[PDB]
Amino acid sequence: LDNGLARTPTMGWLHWERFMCNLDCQEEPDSCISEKLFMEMAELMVSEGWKDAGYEYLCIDDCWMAPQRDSEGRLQADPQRFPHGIRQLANYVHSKGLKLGIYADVGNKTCAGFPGSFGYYDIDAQTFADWGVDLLKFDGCYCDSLENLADGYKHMSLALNRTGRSIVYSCEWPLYMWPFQKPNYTEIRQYCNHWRNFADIDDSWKSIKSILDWTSFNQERIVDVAGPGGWNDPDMLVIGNFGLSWNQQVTQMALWAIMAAPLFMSNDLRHISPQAKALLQDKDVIAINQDPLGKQGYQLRQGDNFEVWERPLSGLAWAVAMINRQEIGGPRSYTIAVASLGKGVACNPACFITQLLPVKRKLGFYEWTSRLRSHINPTGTVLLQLENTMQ
Amino acid sequence: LDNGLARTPTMGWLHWERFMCNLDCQEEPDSCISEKLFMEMAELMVSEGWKDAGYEYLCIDDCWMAPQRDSEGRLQADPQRFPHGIRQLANYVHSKGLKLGIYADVGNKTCAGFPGSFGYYDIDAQTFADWGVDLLKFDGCYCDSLENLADGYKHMSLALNRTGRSIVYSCEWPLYMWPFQKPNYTEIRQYCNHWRNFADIDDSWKSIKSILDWTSFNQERIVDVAGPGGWNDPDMLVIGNFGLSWNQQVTQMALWAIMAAPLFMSNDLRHISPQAKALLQDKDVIAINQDPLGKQGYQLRQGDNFEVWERPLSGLAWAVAMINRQEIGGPRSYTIAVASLGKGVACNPACFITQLLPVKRKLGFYEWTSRLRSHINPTGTVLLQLENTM
Numbered sequence: 109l110d111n112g113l114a115r116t117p118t119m120g121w122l123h124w125e126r127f128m129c130n131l132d133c134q135e136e137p138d139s140c141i142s143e144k145l146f147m148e149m150a151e152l153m154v155s156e157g158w159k160d161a162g163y164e165y166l167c168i169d170d171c172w173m174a175p176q177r178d179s180e181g182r183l184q185a186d187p188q189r190f191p192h193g194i195r196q197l198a199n200y201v202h203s204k205g206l207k208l209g210i211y212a213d214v215g216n217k218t219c220a221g222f223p224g225s226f227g228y229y230d231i232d233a234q235t236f237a238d239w240g241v242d243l244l245k246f247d248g249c250y251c252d253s254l255e256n257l258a259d260g261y262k263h264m265s266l267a268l269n270r271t272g273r274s275i276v277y278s279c280e281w282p283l284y285m286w287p288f289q290k291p292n293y294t295e296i297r298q299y300c301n302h303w304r305n306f307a308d309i310d311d312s313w314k315s316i317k318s319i320l321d322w323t324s325f326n327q328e329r330i331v332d333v334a335g336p337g338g339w340n341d342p343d344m345l346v347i348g349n350f351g352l353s354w355n356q357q358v359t360q361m362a363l364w365a366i367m368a369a370p371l372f373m374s375n376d377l378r379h380i381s382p383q384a385k386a387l388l389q390d391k392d393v394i395a396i397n398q399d400p401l402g403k404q405g406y407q408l409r410q411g412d413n414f415e416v417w418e419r420p421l422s423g424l425a426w427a428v429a430m431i432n433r434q435e436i437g438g439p440r441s442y443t444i445a446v447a448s449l450g451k452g453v454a455c456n457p458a459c460f461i462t463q464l465l466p467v468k469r470k471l472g473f474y475e476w477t478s479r480l481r482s483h484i485n486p487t488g489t490v491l492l493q494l495e496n497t498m499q
Numbered sequence: 500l501d502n503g504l505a506r507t508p509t510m511g512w513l514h515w516e517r518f519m520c521n522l523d524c525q526e527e528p529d530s531c532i533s534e535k536l537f538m539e540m541a542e543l544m545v546s547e548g549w550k551d552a553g554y555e556y557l558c559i560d561d562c563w564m565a566p567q568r569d570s571e572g573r574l575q576a577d578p579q580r581f582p583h584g585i586r587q588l589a590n591y592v593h594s595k596g597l598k599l600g601i602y603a604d605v606g607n608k609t610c611a612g613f614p615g616s617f618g619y620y621d622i623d624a625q626t627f628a629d630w631g632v633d634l635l636k637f638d639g640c641y642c643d644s645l646e647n648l649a650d651g652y653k654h655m656s657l658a659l660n661r662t663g664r665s666i667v668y669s670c671e672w673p674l675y676m677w678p679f680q681k682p683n684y685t686e687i688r689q690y691c692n693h694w695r696n697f698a699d700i701d702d703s704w705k706s707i708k709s710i711l712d713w714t715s716f717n718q719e720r721i722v723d724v725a726g727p728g729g730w731n732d733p734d735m736l737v738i739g740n741f742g743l744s745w746n747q748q749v750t751q752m753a754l755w756a757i758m759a760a761p762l763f764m765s766n767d768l769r770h771i772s773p774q775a776k777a778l779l780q781d782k783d784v785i786a787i788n789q790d791p792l793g794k795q796g797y798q799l800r801q802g803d804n805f806e807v808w809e810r811p812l813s814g815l816a817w818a819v820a821m822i823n824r825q826e827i828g829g830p831r832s833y834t835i836a837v838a839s840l841g842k843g844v845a846c847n848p849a850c851f852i853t854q855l856l857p858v859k860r861k862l863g864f865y866e867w868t869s870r871l872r873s874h875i876n877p878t879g880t881v882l883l884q885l886e887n888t889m
């Protein structure tokens with residue numbers, strides 16, 4: 109989308125995977141979807157390093173709206189869970205120097221059953237602009253047909269542009285087109301800063317694998333449409349939560365960096381381990397994700413329960429990720445010709461290789477003709493930065 | 500098995516899940532199956548408090564044997580990877596106050612394809628006892644028929660008795676019987692100190708879930724037969740490895756306690772996190788697994804993506820485990836009437852509940868009319884001990 113936004117993948121926090129549609133503020137106050145949840149996450153994004161590391165957009169997902177429209181036809185916040193409106197929360201979030209994301213649905217209802225935007229695009233985009241919304245997540249539930257799906261996704265893009273306001277536009281359009289038919293990603297890049305391709309993540313190694321294998325399988329159709337302004341969205345970061353091992357958490361961080369994925373943490377910043385945090389705020393791995401060339405990486409080799417992915421970076425540099433997909437035994441030896449990586453270009457006549465993950469380690473100079481030997485933890489990934497060098 | 504052994508579930512360390520069949524000692528000398536790997540783990544079991552915690556048996560799984568038998572018919576350890584022989588390793592493990600296990604197969608070959616004990620049960624048992632082996636894990640690959648399987652598990656059990664040496668007898672009999680017929684557990688118990696029921700464990704939460712699910716599914720068949728001398732074996736503890744979150748590791752520790760399961764770590768003792776060491780060595784939780792009454796716990800309740808398991812314990816105590824099986828969201832609220840726990844008698848008229856897992860915390864007194872409420876992490880478990888007030 110040519111609105112000047114998401115020149116690198118958007119970065120922030122989204123309530124959905126960790127908080128879901130918890131409406132019960134009486135018995136579950138600490139996890140209900142409430143204005144005070146958002147206000148507290150906003151304070152920690154600032155005091156805990158998050159906004160410094162580039163996490164900028166604090167985003168509301170589904171279940172913030174009142175059961176129906178006001179007597180002017182406009183959406184509203186829940187009166188009990190968000191008594192101060194969206195506009196006061198936006199000021200609050202903006203005062204911390206952060207940006208505010210909201211949620212709506214292209215059809216007659218949102219996914220959880222709240223007011224949809226069909227027949228309301230212009231009114232809502234405007235409403236979002238008058239509130240100070242800075243990103244919109246646009247879901248696709250309860251939609252008549254593909255014709256309406258495309259019409260409505262295209263309409264809202266124009267409506268938001270037509271507001272005057274810089275509002276990052278995040279679509280689940282390819283997801284819901286999937287499939288009556290294969291998405292046309294050029295049409296979508298024209299309308300969307302980023303797009304959900306595949307099924308909702310949850311807090312599992314299963315879910316992670318399935319997204320990698322989905323993308324891996326479908327990379328010839330999706331990797332080249334991504335670049336500054338429009339990204340493929342493999343869904344939220346779930347580091348900090350419960351279902352992933354440390355090694356599976358490095359797999360998720362390493363590969364969302366390779367995929368040039370937006371980075372929306374969905375977790376509880378009040379209760380996150382020091383190692384989850386160091387990982388999420390890893391400056392060298394974020395720099396990869398945020399690399400300004402903005403070409404998405406891809407899967408280079410698959411076999412023998414190993415994968416090799418690599419991303420091209422600015423300045424003739426490359427990120428390389430090796431995955432061990434064998435979930436028995438221990439760290440497995442993997443060796444490859446340095447000439448095989450980065451299209452023979454990294455490492456001609458040499459590259460300096462530094463391991464970023466699972467730990468940060470300067471590894472030596474490697475000549476074009478050199479071999480890299482590594483060892484990879486079951487379900488873990490090894491993440492490497494190759495710097496091209498005169499040598 | 501009325502051999503005086505396994506009066507509480509066996510505790511030790513077993514190489515297979517983490518080290519598998521690595522025969523490559525030139526390129527990976529520190530992780531191949533060699534006498535060295537065993538020596539390292541044996542001194543760490545002593546120096547890092549494993550043995551104080553009750554981990555006693557250091558056990559060799561498959562891939563130790565030389566490719567053929569000696570001129571007199573006896574199994575032999577592999578001459579390059581085990582140059583000193585199994586007896587000397589046994590001498591050595593004994594010196595540290597530990598006991599040594601070894602591994603063989605009922606059939607013609609071991610699962611990796613090394614010499615089986617079929618036709619050699621009497622000589623193999625005697626060879627083992629001659630070496631100072633304190634435990635045999637006996638696997639069921641490469642076996643003709645259900646007859647031979649039963650004949651060989653029975654025969655070996657009797658060869659061992661007759662050495663006059665105490666040797667824990669670990670059996671994979673039931674596992675190899677499914678899907679041909681339902682095993683006779685009353686019979687198995689008579690010949691075995693413990694028995695594997697289900698597929699080999701992985702470094703994965705999928706694997707653990709599927710062991711839990713299999714056990715809770717067949718619990719009517721297996722729970723009551725367990726007790727001092729004879730245990731269901733849900734396979735190795737994998738805590739300390741690569742594939743389980745903290746919360747999944749607690750689940751495995753808690754559930755293996757409720758199930759009165761042998762506790763065989765399969766992990767790298769040389770490289771294990773502090774958190775994973777405190778779990779595996781959690782005194783209060785090992786005390787549950789090791790309860791001298793030896794009645795296996797079971798699943799009480801399953802619903803709305805929660806499970807409740809409970810185990811009866813010495814002295815009118817119970818253990819209760821609450822698992823959250825929903826893989827999305829945050830900690831989720833579970834409530835149950837304490838009248839429903841412990842057959843209605845833990846907590847009549849009252850009980851003191853103390854949470855043990857994920858963190859130790861005294862919770863207070865609960866009248867018979869009370870409800871226990873907890874928040875349970877996705878893939879986590881809360882483990883409680885309940886003391887009846889009397």
Ligand SMILES: *[C@@H]1O[C@H](CO)[C@@H](O[C@@H]2O[C@H](CO)[C@@H](O[C@H]3O[C@H](CO)[C@@H](O)[C@H](O)[C@@H]3O)[C@H](O)[C@H]2NC(C)=O)[C@H](O)[C@H]1NC(C)=O
Nearest residue numbers: 500501502503504656657659660661662663664665666667
């Ligand atoms: C070969 O088989 C024998 C029986 O199948 C087994 O004998 C059993 O040995 C244990 C030794 O601990 C005895 O137990 C202890 O048991 C007495 C009486 O039951 C208790 O009061 C005490 O706790 C005591 O410590 C069993 O009683 C005994 N059972 C029988 C039927 O004799 C042998 O040990 C086996 N031999 C070998 C070397 O495996």
Ligand SMILES: *[C@@H]1O[C@H](CO)[C@@H](O[C@@H]2O[C@H](CO)[C@@H](O)[C@H](O)[C@H]2NC(C)=O)[C@H](O)[C@H]1NC(C)=O
Nearest residue numbers: 109110111112113268269270271272273274275
């Ligand atoms: C409304 O849409 C227009 C059309 O794309 C956007 O204008 C583009 O903005 C970037 C900003 O740097 C320029 O590089 C392009 O040249 C612009 N396109 C055109 C047609 O010149 C405009 O920014 C949008 N406004 C909002 C509020 O999103």
Ligand SMILES: *[C@@H]1O[C@H](CO)[C@@H](O[C@@H]2O[C@H](CO)[C@@H](O)[C@H](O)[C@H]2NC(C)=O)[C@H](O)[C@H]1NC(C)=O
Nearest residue numbers: 214215216217226227250251252253256257260
């Ligand atoms: C939202 O609601 C209305 C009402 O059901 C839908 O509009 C109808 O759509 C049918 C099917 O194409 C049309 O032929 C009718 O003229 C409409 N009927 C009514 C009662 O108005 C609309 O399709 C729904 N929108 C979405 C996005 O699914």
Ligand SMILES: *[C@@H]1O[C@H](CO)[C@@H](O[C@@H]2O[C@H](CO)[C@@H](O)[C@H](O)[C@H]2NC(C)=O)[C@H](O)[C@H]1NC(C)=O
Nearest residue numbers: 110258262290291292293294295296297298299
């Ligand atoms: C997918 O959609 C895009 C844009 O909607 C198509 O590209 C446009 O096609 C028109 C008509 O042929 C051209 O005149 C324009 O130059 C194109 N616009 C853009 C933004 O590139 C694209 O060809 C479609 N692919 C398929 C298979 O339909």
Ligand SMILES: *[C@@H]1O[C@H](CO)[C@@H](O)[C@H](O)[C@H]1NC(C)=O
Nearest residue numbers: 606607617641642643644647
């Ligand atoms: C081992 O193989 C032989 C010869 O083929 C056969 O006699 C016997 O049944 C086998 N043993 C078992 C238990 O399968």
Ligand SMILES: OC[C@H]1O[C@H](O)[C@H](O)[C@@H](O)[C@H]1O
Nearest residue numbers: 124169170219220247280308
């Ligand atoms: O209801 C909210 C929920 O709905 C859709 O399914 C999206 O794909 C999810 O990421 C989340 O927004």
Ligand SMILES: OC[C@H]1O[C@H](O)[C@H](O)[C@@H](O)[C@H]1O
Nearest residue numbers: 515560561609610611638699
């Ligand atoms: O090859 C050895 C391997 O054999 C079988 O698969 C057992 O069930 C495993 O625990 C292990 O001993």
